[PDB]
Design a protein around this ligand. Structure first.
Ligand code: 54Q
Ligand code: 54Q
Ligand code: MN
Ligand code: MN
Ligand code: NA
Lengths: 481, 190, 482, 189
DNA sequence: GGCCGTACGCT
DNA sequence: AGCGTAC
DNA sequence: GGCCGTACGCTT
DNA sequence: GAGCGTAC
């Protein structure tokens, strides 16, 4: 048939626009992940790529993720993953990479066949309990596999590592933070639902970039937290020092977040070359894997090196702003959220995650208990049990007879028929009665949690505090003034 | 990257396929009837002309590749009689990215070769729906399901309104985010 | 200790490389006719459950597994080899089943591996048949973290079937494809006559049989190739002369020579016309299509002798080409120039060994099983005491011991009894054990009979080969003209 | 393309010739920038024992080395202009990496012979094992292979010119048969 | 996704 | 202006 | 293995 | 020749 131009444009564009939006370019407020990042980690999970076990070829990992969950170009997948392994990109890195994974000089990682990976220990905390019905799974694209809609995310990852993503009709820009400060902010909130931003800012000072450096003033920060939008002045950590002979140099040891060191330097070299900046006699990168970042700028003798530096902030990315735009997927729709909203949604998710865990651990402990009761019965009347089976011609017949005589469930009776003879030795019998008693206590432990809303909550608190204590680190970025 | 032309030089019976990706383009060329079907692959997303300036658009290779291939010229210089194919067929993956690429091509035509649509030289192919895209399927099935006239269902593009059509392109592909963002907020079925 | 002699370094360094390429890269094994990259791909396809019944898997996953586990080289060498095996214009008997763009006679490339999928061909299963019955020797993989086979059971003569080409160091190898029917028949004839002449063998095996088909000129090239291992065989396209209207004519080409790129060949023709090197040609057209098949059309000016123009394209273009046979293969881990019969003998002997080893593996296996069944028999008959013995026992070890004492069961027998599930105590189950035991006993005899007579083993090999011929045998594609 | 050390003093400056652009990148970060330069090599390089001068002088790879050494070739070879006093061959611990090593030696021997006699040319000794250079951490490459405190280099020594002249011609030569004989004589299988 | 280097033997 | 997922 | 194309939005 | 086919 025919197709009207106006309606095909409207419809085509929207299918695209909605897709980039809800399934590519924007993170989920609960785990702070985009589709590509989540599937990679879920891929490290299911491929058993834990920190204890050995690295695995990056090509093999990416192939799995693309064959099973992510039907998109392989380059898209690999570079997202590469970024997770970079301690200058992720405030709390999620991939543990072996091989060349790039550097601040904007040099890329080597090709995936040359590199290997596994999780970092903190990734483990993202997926912890993923298999205890804590989160809803979904069909994969071809319907072959199930994948997670979201991760347990037992630390508040959206804010920890931030997110930058350009969608259609919108985009997001969320900066990293200090894990410790975040969790404390979370804990504070759980004790006060009507907590203000101001009071949250007692715990969370501001953004904390993997790259360290300096922030200028609190106002941009302040505005960004109250609205979800604001400008943050990021400066480099630079000092002026004598090189001897009455000559000084400027030395730079930290650079702004998401700034290419190399490119910034060529920007300076270019300004000197074109004479748009007076007073510089030499420029060197002394950065070594041992001595860390160190960029040097020799100042012509008797030149005021402070003034030069000032202009260097004016004319190069030595100072750069970070435009905070905090749009995240909330209930499957794009929303601009202030800081408190960001924490509120994360908290509700940890509530549901631990609740669902505890309920799942229960179902399954009762499921196993029921079985052990079925086995104990058998141990008690083992002679009768045997008689009953031996006198049965068929397993189904034996199933029926066993259910009828000893008043068993079908499950209990199947279990008995599958029981190996060695389970009758002294120790094997003790093991069954020992598992059961331990299990009865567990059940009643679990039932307590679910019987009180506050117990549950405090459990969540403790479980955070623990993560905070193991993983929380020092603030890197200095907030001046 | 390189157009593969057909045998027949008579435009009445000639059709040109704008394919998505060079793996699909390669498959298409074997599968096609080389006698009347010319294929031009496009490598990924193409320039959004609605948002770009003239010097850029003219210089861009993909835009140029197609103008040369159609043989009409553009704007005031357009000559529908200079057309080398009476069928220009958009063949993109059955996915959102393929569908994006679609809106981008349609943006170009309606803006630079508008007479070509009104003439009904512009069609949309319809390959198998589902998760596999064009580069993943065989050349014998690309032909039998999308290119072969005996079984294929193409979609001739028509335009009843031009003022409405001008607002749409401007709204959807224009450089004003907000009118786009509002349109998404009004038709968003999450 | 800081010092290296340039002469000594160069000799050692070059030899290590040359040796490696020769025995572990560029040359095929005389037994499965595979190079290492190819052997590991098919092993991997097997290790991964990529059988014809199973659905296609993306080629990138396959390559990553092949790379990561067996083959520590560039994924391009890998995927490319795999792609060749899936092309019916490359493989006379393709071993890979590809979904997607795997490329063409003109020789476009396959799509990158993230676009394509694959799995085994039904014929490949026959290479892997019995591989898990200790028929062939496994070895350590490079990182010593895995095991790979040193060769495949290769239940058909694959070296000669698909052939091989490879540039080694100090040597090269060129071996053409053959008709499997004629191939197996050759072997059958060898097996009944350890003294058969090449000439006699050639009564079965006429000559090569290219997937691309086409024609061969004369038997002399083939005979020299088969007697000595080297020789030039002349590969002519299938072209006919036909009328086109107005009393004019055209040459139509429908089968080109093996390993020739159709497009490149066409360019050469075009070039000759442009450069005036040839005369009488007014047009050139590839009208190849999937339905039509390969059709290349050359238009001849009226009153111009086509058959003459034809001869000139044979002389002046790849339209006629030479296959320089150079039959070098790994024999006993060493490169050797073999003739036809030599080839067929190292194959056959492989098969005897493979069938013998399989039979022996089965035997040990069946005897093992029986032993266990005997132990179970005893337990079911004496079950009440057996159960009591275990209940009294405080551990497995205690239970084991007592059971062996009272019933003179073996350690493995008792172990099987302690692992028995209760459901095996139903009345029907006792009958099932008995039936299984009886079949086994018969089975054991059968197997023993084969081991007892080398002739019986040999006939078994003959019978198994013949079934493959019947199932996978097909018609000779290449015509031989004298 | 080359990554060069800051120091302009040849005596103390070393250029590593590294196999692959993966290994090259790791090496640039890993190396000590003061004294250590890196020229990566994109795979197998031209065998000059088989090539004529025209081609050799047009080879990108061959051209980059000439330029980087700045000593000139042949009679014009001026060991005095050597921009590095240590020229290091760094390849994988596999047979391909050893092949590449023989490709380099042939060249030095045939065009910068005095460079060897001066003992300027060395062979690195990375971990023998199952890992290529482009798979190792940069920090790992530095300590094992590159840090002069820990590394074990092999200075290449030329004992005898006639013996060296005959061997290069046999091993890298255009005539296959003598190479085939050499293998046949010396293969242990 | 494509284009391109190189070695290696043979014809 | 260039961050980062896509073709 | 390294080049390089395009779309998408944006800091009160 | 230059291109077959595994490698860097
Ligand atoms: C599939 C590719 C083929 N390849 C190519 C390809 C092209 C060129 N070239 O154009 O100079 C050089 C090399 C040499 C090559 C390269 O590009 N880079 C490198 O570092 N090593 C290589 O062998 C090689 C790589 C590893 O694999
Ligand atoms: C990782 C690569 C990136 N890429 C590139 C890369 C470079 C260019 N380019 O320089 O014009 C175009 C495209 C467009 C691209 C291509 O090269 N070919 C293609 O067919 N489609 C694409 O989108 C794309 C491919 C699929 O994936
Ligand atoms: Mn697609
Ligand atoms: Mn290597
Ligand atoms: Na010829």
């Amino acid at each position: 048939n025919e197709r009207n131009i106006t309606s095909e444009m409207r419809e085509s564009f929207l299918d695209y626009a909605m897709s980039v939006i809800v399934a590519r370019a924007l993170p989920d407020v609960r785990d702070g992940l985009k589709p590509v990042h989540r599937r990679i980690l879920y891929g490290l999970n299911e491929q058993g790529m834990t920190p204890d076990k050995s690295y695995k070829k990056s090509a093999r990992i990416v192939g799995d993720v693309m064959g099973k969950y992510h039907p998109h170009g392989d380059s898209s997948i690999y570079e997202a993953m590469v970024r997770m392994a970079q301690d200058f990109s992720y405030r709390y890195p999620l991939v543990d990479g072996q091989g060349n994974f790039g550097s601040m000089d904007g040099d890329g990682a080597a090709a995936m066949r040359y590199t290997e990976a596994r999780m970092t220990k903190i990734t483990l905390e993202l997926l912890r309990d993923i298999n205890k019905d804590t989160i809803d799974f979904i069909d994969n694209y071809d319907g072959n596999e199930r994948e997670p809609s979201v991760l347990p995310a037992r630390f508040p990852n959206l804010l920890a590592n931030g997110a930058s993503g350009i969608a259609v009709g919108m985009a997001t820009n969320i900066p990293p933070h200090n894990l410790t400060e975040l969790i404390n902010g979370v804990l504070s909130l759980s004790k006060n639902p009507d907590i203000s931003i101001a009071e949250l800012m007692e715990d969370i000072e501001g953004p904390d970039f993997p790259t360290a450096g300096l922030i200028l003033g609190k106002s941009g920060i302040r505005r960004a937290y109250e609205t979800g939008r604001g400008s943050i002045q990021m400066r480099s950590r630079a000092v002026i020092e004598e090189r001897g002979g009455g000559r000084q140099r400027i030395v730079v040891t930290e650079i702004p977040f998401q700034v290419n060191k190399a490119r910034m330097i060529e920007k300076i070299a270019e300004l000197v070359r074109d004479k748009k900046i007076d007073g510089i006699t030499d420029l060197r990168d002394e950065t070594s894997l041992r001595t860390g970042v160190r960029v040097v700028i020799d100042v012509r003798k008797d030149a005021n090196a402070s003034v030069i530096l000032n202009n260097l902030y004016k004319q190069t990315p030595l100072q750069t702003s970070f435009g905070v735009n905090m749009i995240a997927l909330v209930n499957g729709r794009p929303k601009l959220i202030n800081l408190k909203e960001a924490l509120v949604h994360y908290l509700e998710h940890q509530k549901t995650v631990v609740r669902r865990r505890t309920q799942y651990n229960l179902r399954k402990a009762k499921d196993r208990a029921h079985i052990l009761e079925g086995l104990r019965i058998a141990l008690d009347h083992i002679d009768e049990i045997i008689s009953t089976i031996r006198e049965s011609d068929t397993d189904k017949v034996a199933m029926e007879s066993l259910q009828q005589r000893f008043k068993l469930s079908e499950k209990q009776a199947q279990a008995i028929l599958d029981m190996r003879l060695r389970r009758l030795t002294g120790l094997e019998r003790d093991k069954i009665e020992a598992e059961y008693n331990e299990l009865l206590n567990y059940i009643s432990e679990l039932e307590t949690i679910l019987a009180d809303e506050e117990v549950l909550l405090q459990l969540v608190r403790d479980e955070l505090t623990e993560i905070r204590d193991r993983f929380g680190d020092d603030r890197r970025t200095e907030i001046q003034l | 990257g390189k157009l593969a032309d057909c045998s027949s030089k008579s435009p009445e019976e000639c059709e040109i396929f704008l394919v998505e990706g060079d793996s699909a383009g390669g498959s298409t060329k074997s599968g096609r009837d080389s006698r009347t079907q010319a294929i031009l692959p496009l490598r990924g997303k193409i320039l959004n002309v609605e948002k770009a300036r003239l010097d850029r658009i003219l210089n861009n290779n993909e835009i140029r590749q197609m103008i040369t291939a159609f043989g009409t010229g553009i704007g005031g210089d357009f000559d529908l009689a200079k057309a080398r194919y009476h069928k220009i067929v958009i063949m993109t993956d059955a996915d959102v990215d393929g569908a994006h690429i679609r809106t981008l091509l349609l943006t170009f035509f309606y803006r630079f070769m508008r007479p070509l649509i009104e003439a009904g030289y512009v069609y949309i192919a319809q390959p198998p729906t589902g998760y596999k895209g064009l580069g993943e399927m065989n050349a014998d099935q690309l032909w039998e399901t999308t290119m072969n006239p005996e079984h294929r269902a193409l979609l001739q593009v028509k335009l009843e309104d031009a003022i409405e059509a001008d607002q749409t392109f401007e709204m959807l592909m224009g450089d004003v985010v907000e009118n786009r963002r509002q349109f998404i907020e009004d038709n968003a079925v999450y």
